[model samples]
Target: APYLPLASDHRNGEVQTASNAWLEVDLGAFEHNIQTLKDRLGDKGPKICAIMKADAYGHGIDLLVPSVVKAGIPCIGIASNEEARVAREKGFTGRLMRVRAATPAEVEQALPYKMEELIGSLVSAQGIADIAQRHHTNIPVHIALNSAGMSRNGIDLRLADSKEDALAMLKLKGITPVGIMTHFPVEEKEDVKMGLAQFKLDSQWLLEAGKLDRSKITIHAANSFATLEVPDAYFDMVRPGGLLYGDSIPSYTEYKRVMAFKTQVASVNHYPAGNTVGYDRTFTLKRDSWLANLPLGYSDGYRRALSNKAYVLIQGQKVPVVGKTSMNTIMVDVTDLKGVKPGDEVVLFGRQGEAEVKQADLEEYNGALLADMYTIWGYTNPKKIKRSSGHHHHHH
Candidate 1:
């Protein structure tokens, strides 16, 4: 297990030698990002439901849920029962919304967590309704529509009897329809306009057919990109997963990145020119140089595709990876970085002195999504928590 270290514990500048590599999750940066998003929504704007799916996008739900709670976020989006359980355990008593459809067993198992489900079909609706009836309780649920082209888990309104099926779901005795939602497949303005128009039409039809009050039930349809780029998609709430964690969206530049992946130089050696490096000998030194071997590789969630393409920051200088990334090591050409010796800190993806490796840079270099990169890094490496204050307190 990874040790959770406070920033205060490192005031003496000693590297955490407990692990050769580790991820530092900055709770202060997370709180800042949350506050920034809230400020963007301001007064009278739709509420912001912080999305914590995929183990808070692999930033460790246990570590971040408290930050969410401190921020006073009224709702959180989750995708698994364990995520909901961890959120609740970490003092997040707000609404736990399952961002995707779940199995009948999953729904029943998640009841203790009070997960508000996203139902897409009559079968799933009936399954949950039966469970609620068995438990003698009413389950609150959100209807997922395929109005946007995200063909996964959403009821296609274009299908015959799809509207009837949705209306039937509303009438199920053990279920309470509290929201209507859809996911946008694209973030372009024109695409969002088309999806929003369709979603509105479908939502209005559902409300009218079910005789449900429009003001009572929530209507939400914005992911991180949509939330930042399409205000019209922010019907009653916006669910943002990537944006809150500072995943780059061109429209918003104020978000502070919450996670920093770091490692240490295990050894630095002099390699003569004409010598080949690591697995396939893909790289050959053009000149006599000093190469630093980092104690991390693809097995540590560092992408192998970055073998000869990516750069790591050492002593504030950008150094290039010089060979095929082995399962547990990568060699960086560090000849120009004066005095970069063993135990010197190396940044995989984060700020280092005046230089930095942004998530966007890794995404372009390795052809991976920013979220995927962070999630893998967070899940694979031992994590150290970096908090702004030693004591826990509300960000507000």
Candidate 2:
């Protein structure tokens, strides 16, 4: 059979009679989450830099930017110039920061957009400076420090000579060295403790050795986890990513979940005990069962690993999966429920009636980071979804 997937326009709030798979994003919850972080940071807090990488953490950046800018975020963190371009095109006036160092072509492409660059090396910094000269503008650059133990990016200042060389190179670059920053490895209290001590030790040492000018350079660190766990890590700007879109830790519960991954029952039928379901008889019915199949499966970001281990909310009740997850179909045991019918709502990882499944719970079951799960789900099925705003909805 030809695979003609059904359609539903979520960005414009259009519904599709042919499609039940969709993702609903609550803008109000997003707004609340952003404000919640701001409140926690206090009035004298560092500038709020909303991390909008990975399409606003898979919430669709086009729909997320206005509320972010309106929420008073002074800057937005993006992984590339393409995202920075989207921010400008979407009418976001605040500073757009490229969280990664730009390639030579990317630096050239981003020059006219006034995008800020995070530089990990003198070579990258020089590239930006040279590109900026060609465009007749000064590029704003943030020098990254590898004092926080990631060693992924950023200049290492472990040795006094190396630290002095890095700082001296900064003076030679034509671009404006607007900031100096570092990143934490984890959100745990212990990680934050290490990050704070290291950042201070590095900064204090650099300053005493006349290798860095604190007055000329703005300082920043603290990602989503650190912002909540390590208040002292907050410096000139607090850059947070997943926390805004509801990828939360156990310790922080002030913010609401921003995404609602949803779908509906596509078909319903009955089966007798010992009857098989799905391909290769992966599951055999144990009793008289009412099976409701959804147009959701491993192909739609529902991993095959969740075959028998997963549960979905149907009519406010948790229904277990009966068979192996297929490319585009998943059968659930809905025998305990009343009036199983096509289009009956199904909740994958969101609220339904009085029952709810938190992202953390799902991530725990999948044995993956919430980020890994959320990122995959962002590109999944459910063609018809809607974006809504108002009072946050909590079915519990």
Top lDDT hit = 1
lDDT (Cα atoms) of all candidates against the true structure: 0.83, 0.75
Candidate 1 colliding pairs: none
lDDT computed for candidate 1: 0.83
Error of 2 at 109 (Å): 2.5
The count of residue-pair clashes in candidate 2 stands at 4
True-vs-predicted CA distance for residue 179, candidate 1, Å = 0.8
- Give me the runs in candidate 1 sitting further than 4 Å from their true place: 1-17, 306-308, 387-396
Model 2 stretches astray by more than 4 angstroms: 1-20, 159-165, 172-174, 204-216, 304-308, 381-396
TM-score of each: 0.89, 0.86
Candidate 1 residue-wise lDDT, 2-38, digit = tens: 3333323332112344677888888788999999988
TM-score, structure 2 vs. true: 0.86
